[PDB]
Structure 1
Amino acid sequence: SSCRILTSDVFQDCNKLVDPEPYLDVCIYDTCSCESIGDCACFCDTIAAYAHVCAQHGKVVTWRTATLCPQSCEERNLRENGYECEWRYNSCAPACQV
């Protein structure tokens, strides 16, 4: 059931382009074998691998919430005493900037 996030309301755009059946078989295989205890990374990394392929075909996606694979970004805005708050989690931003 939890690997059916790959077939959910938020991915319906990409499921028509990229078949999810390959990326689902990996999900069931990994997180069965994986004994996830503190870090739920053996699950959150198989979906991100599908979202990135969906992004290359122009379908940006925001699937990540606070109760599922949170990915905070607040520690980079810490070394300065004054909290400027410029670092943020952006769903799919350009990698090649200046």
Structure 2
Amino acid sequence: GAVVSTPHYSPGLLIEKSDAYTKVYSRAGLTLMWNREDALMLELDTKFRNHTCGLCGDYNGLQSYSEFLSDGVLFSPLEFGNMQKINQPDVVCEDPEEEVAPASCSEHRAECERLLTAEAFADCQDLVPLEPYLRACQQDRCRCPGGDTCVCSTVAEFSRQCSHAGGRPGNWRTATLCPKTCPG
């Protein structure tokens, strides 16, 4: 209930604010990091295995086992997300309905593969995979026409998963490929 001046150093909880991210470091084995628009990532230690229950799945280590196939029925990602909702006791908020199944956007696989496997991402091809983050690049090209503001939040996420396992990416942002400005 009180506004904190950052950094905040209480002996179980560190809350600090850069120009880019807001970090929260807890002794319970939790680390949150959020640029203040859209990207949110969480890190838990190996103590919480078989206990987590959020929209991030459980933390058993098994690929798609108990998140989507609970009792033999395969849950779609739209009905997996509506199960994770929180009821607020004043506001009624409508769940998003099933859109009609679009075409699998395979006419832009050449552009996502050329862009994301550039020379700047050399020492992370063995750390993080290619197939999930290129699949997510498929919808960002055909659901976001015109300006390129959806394709450079996925390769910006590829260069954050690169630099979290331990690797070091290079500079890919040119003057025509999603530039960023800072004063001085």
TM-score (norm 1): 0.65
Q: Tell me if structure 1 keeps the 8 A contact 2:173–2:179.
A: yes
Instruction: Indicate yes or no: 2:160 matched with 1:52.
Output: yes
CA–CA distance in structure 2, aligned partners of residues 53 and 36 of structure 1: 27
How many residue pairs match? The answer is 73
Structure 1 or 2: more strand by fraction: 2
Partner of 1:65: 174
- In the TM superposition, what whole-angstrom CA distance separates every residue of 1:21-71 from its partner, at most 9, and x where no partner exists? 10001101121111234xx21111010011100011122222211121111
RMSD: 1.5
Q: Distance in 2 between matches of 1:46 and 1:36?
A: 17
Give the number of the structure with larger relative contact order, counting CA–CA contacts within 8 Å between residues 6 or more apart: 1
Runs of 4+ in 1 over 2 A off after TM superposition: none
C-alpha distance in structure 1 between counterparts of 2:111 and 2:177, whole Å: 10
1:73-93 Cα shifts (integer Å, max 9, x gaps): 13xxxxxxxxxx2xxxxxxxx
**Once the two structures are aligned, what percentage of the paired residues are identical?**
42
Larger Rg: 2
Q: Is the 8 A contact 2:124 2:168 kept in 1?
A: no
TM-score by length of 2: 0.37
Q: Which is richer in helix?
A: 1
Gaps of 5+ in 2: 1-109
